[PDB]
Short mmCIF file of C-alpha atoms and ligand atoms in Angstrom, two decimals:
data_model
loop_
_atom_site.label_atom_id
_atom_site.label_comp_id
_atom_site.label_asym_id
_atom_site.label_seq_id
_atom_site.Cartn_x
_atom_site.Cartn_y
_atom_site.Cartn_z
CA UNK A 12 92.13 102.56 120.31
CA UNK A 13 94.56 101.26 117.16
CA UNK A 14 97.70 99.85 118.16
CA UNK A 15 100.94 102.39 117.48
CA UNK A 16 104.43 101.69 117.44
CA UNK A 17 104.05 103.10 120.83
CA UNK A 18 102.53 99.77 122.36
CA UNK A 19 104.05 97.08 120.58
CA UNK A 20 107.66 95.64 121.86
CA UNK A 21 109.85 94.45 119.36
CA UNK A 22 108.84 90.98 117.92
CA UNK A 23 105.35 90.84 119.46
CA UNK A 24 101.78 91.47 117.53
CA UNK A 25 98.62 93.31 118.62
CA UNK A 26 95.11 91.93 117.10
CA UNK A 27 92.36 94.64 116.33
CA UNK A 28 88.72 93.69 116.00
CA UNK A 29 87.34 95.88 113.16
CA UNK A 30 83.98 93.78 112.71
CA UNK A 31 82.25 90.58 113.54
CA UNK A 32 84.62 88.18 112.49
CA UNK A 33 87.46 90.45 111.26
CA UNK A 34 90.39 91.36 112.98
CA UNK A 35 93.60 93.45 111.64
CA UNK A 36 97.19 91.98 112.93
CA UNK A 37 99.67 95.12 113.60
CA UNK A 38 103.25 94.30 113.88
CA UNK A 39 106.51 96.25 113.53
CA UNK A 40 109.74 95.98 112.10
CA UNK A 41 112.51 98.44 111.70
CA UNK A 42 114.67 99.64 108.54
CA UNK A 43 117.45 102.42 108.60
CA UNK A 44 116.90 102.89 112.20
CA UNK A 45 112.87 104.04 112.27
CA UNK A 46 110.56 101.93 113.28
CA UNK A 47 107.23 100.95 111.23
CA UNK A 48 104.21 99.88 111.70
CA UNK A 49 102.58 96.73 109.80
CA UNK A 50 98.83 95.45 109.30
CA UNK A 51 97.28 92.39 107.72
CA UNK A 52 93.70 90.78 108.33
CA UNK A 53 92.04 87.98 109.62
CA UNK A 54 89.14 86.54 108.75
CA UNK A 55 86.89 84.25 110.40
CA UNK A 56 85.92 81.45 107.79
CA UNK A 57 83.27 78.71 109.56
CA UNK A 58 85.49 77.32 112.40
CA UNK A 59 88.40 78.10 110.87
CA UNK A 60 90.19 81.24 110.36
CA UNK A 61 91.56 83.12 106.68
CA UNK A 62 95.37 85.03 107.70
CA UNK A 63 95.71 87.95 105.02
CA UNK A 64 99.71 88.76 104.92
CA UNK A 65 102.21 87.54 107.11
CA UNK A 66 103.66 89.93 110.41
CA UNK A 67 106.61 90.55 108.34
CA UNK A 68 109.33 88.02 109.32
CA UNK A 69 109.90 84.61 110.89
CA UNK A 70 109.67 85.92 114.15
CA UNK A 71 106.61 88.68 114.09
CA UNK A 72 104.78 85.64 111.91
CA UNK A 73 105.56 82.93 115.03
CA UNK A 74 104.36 85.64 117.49
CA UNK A 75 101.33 86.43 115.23
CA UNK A 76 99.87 82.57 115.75
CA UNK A 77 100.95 82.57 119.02
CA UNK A 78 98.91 85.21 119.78
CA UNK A 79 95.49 84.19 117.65
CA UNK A 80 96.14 80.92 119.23
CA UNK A 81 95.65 82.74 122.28
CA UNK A 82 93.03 85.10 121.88
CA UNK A 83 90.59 84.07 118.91
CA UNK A 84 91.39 79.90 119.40
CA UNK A 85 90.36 78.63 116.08
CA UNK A 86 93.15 77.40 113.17
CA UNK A 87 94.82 79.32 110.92
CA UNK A 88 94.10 76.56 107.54
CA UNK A 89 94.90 79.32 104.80
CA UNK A 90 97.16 82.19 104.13
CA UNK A 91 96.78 84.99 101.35
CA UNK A 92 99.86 87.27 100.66
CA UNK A 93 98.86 89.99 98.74
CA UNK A 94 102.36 91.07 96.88
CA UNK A 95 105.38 89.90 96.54
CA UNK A 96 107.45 92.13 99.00
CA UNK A 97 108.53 90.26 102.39
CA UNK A 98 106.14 92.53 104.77
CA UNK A 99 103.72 90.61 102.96
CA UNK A 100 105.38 86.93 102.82
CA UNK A 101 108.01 87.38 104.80
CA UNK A 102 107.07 84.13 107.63
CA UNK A 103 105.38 82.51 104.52
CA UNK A 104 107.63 79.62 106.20
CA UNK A 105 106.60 79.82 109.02
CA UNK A 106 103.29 79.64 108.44
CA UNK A 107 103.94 76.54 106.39
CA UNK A 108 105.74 74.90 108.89
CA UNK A 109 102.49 75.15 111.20
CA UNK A 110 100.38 73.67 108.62
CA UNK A 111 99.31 76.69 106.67
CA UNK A 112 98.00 76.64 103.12
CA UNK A 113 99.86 79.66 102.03
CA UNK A 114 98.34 81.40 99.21
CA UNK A 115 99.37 83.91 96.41
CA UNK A 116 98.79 84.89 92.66
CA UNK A 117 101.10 83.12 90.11
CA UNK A 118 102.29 86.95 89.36
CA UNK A 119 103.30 86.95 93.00
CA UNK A 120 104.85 83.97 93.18
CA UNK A 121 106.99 85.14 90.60
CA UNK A 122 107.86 88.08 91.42
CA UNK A 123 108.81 86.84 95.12
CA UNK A 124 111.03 84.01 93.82
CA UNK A 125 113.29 86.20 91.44
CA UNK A 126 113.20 88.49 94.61
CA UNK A 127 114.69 85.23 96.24
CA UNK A 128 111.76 85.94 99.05
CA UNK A 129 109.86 83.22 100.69
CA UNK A 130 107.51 82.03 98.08
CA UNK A 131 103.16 81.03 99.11
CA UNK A 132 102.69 77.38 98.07
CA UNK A 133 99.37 77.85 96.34
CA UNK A 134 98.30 79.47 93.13
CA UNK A 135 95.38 81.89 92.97
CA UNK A 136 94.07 81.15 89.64
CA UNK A 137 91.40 84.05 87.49
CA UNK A 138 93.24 87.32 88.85
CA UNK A 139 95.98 87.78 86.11
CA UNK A 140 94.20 90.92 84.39
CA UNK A 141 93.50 94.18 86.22
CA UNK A 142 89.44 93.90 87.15
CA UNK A 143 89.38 90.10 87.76
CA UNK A 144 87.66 89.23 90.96
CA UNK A 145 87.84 85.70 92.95
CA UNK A 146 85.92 84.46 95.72
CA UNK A 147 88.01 82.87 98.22
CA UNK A 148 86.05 81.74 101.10
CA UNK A 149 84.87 84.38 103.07
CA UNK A 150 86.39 87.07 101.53
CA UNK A 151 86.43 88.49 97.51
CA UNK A 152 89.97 88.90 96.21
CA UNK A 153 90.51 92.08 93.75
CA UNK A 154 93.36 92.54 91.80
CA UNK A 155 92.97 96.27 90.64
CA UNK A 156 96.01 96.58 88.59
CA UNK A 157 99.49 97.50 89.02
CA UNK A 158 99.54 100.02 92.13
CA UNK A 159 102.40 99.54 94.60
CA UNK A 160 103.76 96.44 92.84
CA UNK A 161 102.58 95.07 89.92
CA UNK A 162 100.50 92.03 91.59
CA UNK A 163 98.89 94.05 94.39
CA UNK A 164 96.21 92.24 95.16
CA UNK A 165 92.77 93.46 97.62
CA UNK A 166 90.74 91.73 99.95
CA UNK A 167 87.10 92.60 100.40
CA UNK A 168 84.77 90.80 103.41
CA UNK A 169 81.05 91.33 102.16
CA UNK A 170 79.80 90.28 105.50
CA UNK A 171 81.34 93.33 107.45
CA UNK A 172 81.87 95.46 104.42
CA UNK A 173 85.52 95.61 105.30
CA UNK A 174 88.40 96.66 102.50
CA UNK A 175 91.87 95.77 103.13
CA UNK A 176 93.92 97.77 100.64
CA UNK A 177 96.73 96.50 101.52
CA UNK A 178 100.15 98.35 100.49
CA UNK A 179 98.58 99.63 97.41
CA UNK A 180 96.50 101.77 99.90
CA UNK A 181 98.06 105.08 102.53
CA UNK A 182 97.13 105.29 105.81
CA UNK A 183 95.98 109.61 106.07
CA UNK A 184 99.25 110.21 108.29
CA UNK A 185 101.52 109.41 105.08
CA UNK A 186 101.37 112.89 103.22
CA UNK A 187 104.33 111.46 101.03
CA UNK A 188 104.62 108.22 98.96
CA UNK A 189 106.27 105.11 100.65
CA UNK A 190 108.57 102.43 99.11
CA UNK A 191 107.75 102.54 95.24
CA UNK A 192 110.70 101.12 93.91
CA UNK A 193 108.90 98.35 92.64
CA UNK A 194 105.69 100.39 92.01
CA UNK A 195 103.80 101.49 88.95
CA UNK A 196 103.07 105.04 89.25
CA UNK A 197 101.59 105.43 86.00
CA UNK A 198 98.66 103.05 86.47
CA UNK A 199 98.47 103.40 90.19
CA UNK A 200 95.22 105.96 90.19
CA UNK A 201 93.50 103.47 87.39
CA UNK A 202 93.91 100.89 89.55
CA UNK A 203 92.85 102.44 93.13
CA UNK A 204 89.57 103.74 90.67
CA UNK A 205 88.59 100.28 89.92
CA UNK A 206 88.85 99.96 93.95
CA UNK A 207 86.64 102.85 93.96
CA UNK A 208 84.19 101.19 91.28
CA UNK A 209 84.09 97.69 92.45
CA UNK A 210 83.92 98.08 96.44
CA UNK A 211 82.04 101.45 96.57
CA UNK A 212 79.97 100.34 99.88
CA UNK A 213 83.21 99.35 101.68
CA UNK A 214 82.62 100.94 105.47
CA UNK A 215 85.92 99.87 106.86
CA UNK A 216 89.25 100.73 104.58
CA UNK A 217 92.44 98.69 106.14
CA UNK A 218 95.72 100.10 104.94
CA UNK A 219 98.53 98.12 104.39
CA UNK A 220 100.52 100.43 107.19
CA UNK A 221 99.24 102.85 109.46
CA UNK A 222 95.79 103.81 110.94
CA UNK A 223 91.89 102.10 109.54
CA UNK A 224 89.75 104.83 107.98
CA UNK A 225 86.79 104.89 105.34
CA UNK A 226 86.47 105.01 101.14
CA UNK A 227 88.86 108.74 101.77
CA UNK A 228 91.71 106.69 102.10
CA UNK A 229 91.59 106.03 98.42
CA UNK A 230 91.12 109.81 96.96
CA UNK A 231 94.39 110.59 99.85
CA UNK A 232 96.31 107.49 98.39
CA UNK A 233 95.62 108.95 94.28
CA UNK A 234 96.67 112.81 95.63
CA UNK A 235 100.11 111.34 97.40
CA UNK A 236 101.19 109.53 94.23
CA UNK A 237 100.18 112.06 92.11
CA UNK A 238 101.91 113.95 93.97
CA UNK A 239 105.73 111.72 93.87
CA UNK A 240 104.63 111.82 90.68
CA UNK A 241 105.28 115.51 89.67
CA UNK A 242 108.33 115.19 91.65
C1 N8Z B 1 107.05 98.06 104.74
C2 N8Z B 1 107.10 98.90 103.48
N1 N8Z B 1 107.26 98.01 102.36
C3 N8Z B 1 106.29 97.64 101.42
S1 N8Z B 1 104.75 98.51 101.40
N2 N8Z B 1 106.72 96.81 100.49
N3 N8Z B 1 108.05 96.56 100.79
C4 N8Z B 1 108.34 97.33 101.97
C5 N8Z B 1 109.68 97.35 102.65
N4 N8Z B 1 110.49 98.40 102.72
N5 N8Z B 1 111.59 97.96 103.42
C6 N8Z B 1 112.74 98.79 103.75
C7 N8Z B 1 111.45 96.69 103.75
C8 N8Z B 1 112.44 95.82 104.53
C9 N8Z B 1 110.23 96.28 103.26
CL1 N8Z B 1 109.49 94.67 103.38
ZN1 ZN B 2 105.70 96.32 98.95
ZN1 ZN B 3 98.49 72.73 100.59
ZN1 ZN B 4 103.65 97.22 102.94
#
């Protein structure tokens, strides 16, 4: 019952209820003619609600409150982007514009402005070395070390035991590694092992692309990079 390519037109979103309370966003954009698939999370915090990622662009991000608007009817108040790349804050604007507290680590917020991207407004203080855990509202923010970008960053609900990996983890389809120009192969396995370590009751894993599983999406992640890796 996940959302594919196959049933979301250009520019709209699809909203997938993984638990009470949580919901994943699925999006799509294309690049050099293919078409992929894009999640984030939402979280229901009180009466409010906690977006994790944009919809990747201006246009999937307007469509993306449109559509909560719609269908859960309580306000978007804060935004975490959990790296730097523009799948991630990529409507960051957008979301501003609409009265979003947008969100991100100062190591993102770097790395997004000398990437001349859209740049979250707030600073996530306490998540600067690999192992340091936040509590933002309803959800625990993990930043496991340098994975898929330097400033990856996790999201863990301990209501609904539900792990959003986001880019740093593979969906099963992807048998071989994604965009890792920016990525640090080296320490990626370290980092997806403190995952393992800190988050090892996690029934739900969300990947940043592609199709929900459980905890196996981290030991598939680890045996694709190691994998590029002895390219
Ligand atoms: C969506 C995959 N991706 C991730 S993960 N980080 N960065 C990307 C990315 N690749 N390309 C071609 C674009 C436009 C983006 Cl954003
Ligand atoms: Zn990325
Ligand atoms: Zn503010
Ligand atoms: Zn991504």
């Amino acid at each position: 019952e996940y959302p594919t390519v196959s049933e979301i037109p250009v520019g709209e979103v699809r909203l997938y209820q993984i638990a009470d309370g949580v919901w994943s966003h699925i999006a799509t954009q294309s690049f050099d003619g293919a078409v992929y698939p894009s999640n984030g999370l939402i979280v229901r915090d009180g009466d409010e609600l906690l977006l994790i990622d944009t919809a990747w662009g201006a246009k999937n991000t307007a469509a993306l409150l449109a559509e909560i608007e719609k269908q859960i009817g309580l306000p978007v108040t804060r935004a975490v982007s959990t790296h730097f790349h523009d799948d991630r804050v990529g409507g960051v604007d957008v979301l501003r514009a609409a009265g979003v507290a947008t969100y991100a680590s100062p190591s993102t917020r770097r790395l997004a402005e000398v990437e001349g991207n859209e740049i979250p407004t707030h600073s996530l203080e306490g998540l600067s070395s690999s192992g340091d855990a936040v509590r933002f509202g309803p959800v625990e923010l993990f930043y496991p070390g340098a994975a898929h970008s330097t400033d990856n960053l996790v999201v863990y609900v301990p209501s609904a035991s539900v792990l959003y990996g986001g880019c740093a983890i593979y969906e099963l389809s992807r048998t071989s590694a994604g965009n890792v120009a920016d990525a640090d192969l080296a320490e990626w396995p370290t980092s997806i092992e403190r995952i393992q370590q800190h988050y090892p009751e996690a029934q739900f894993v969300i990947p940043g692309h592609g199709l929900p599983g459980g905890l196996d999406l981290l030991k598939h992640t680890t045996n694709v990079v190691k994998a590029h890796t002895n390219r």
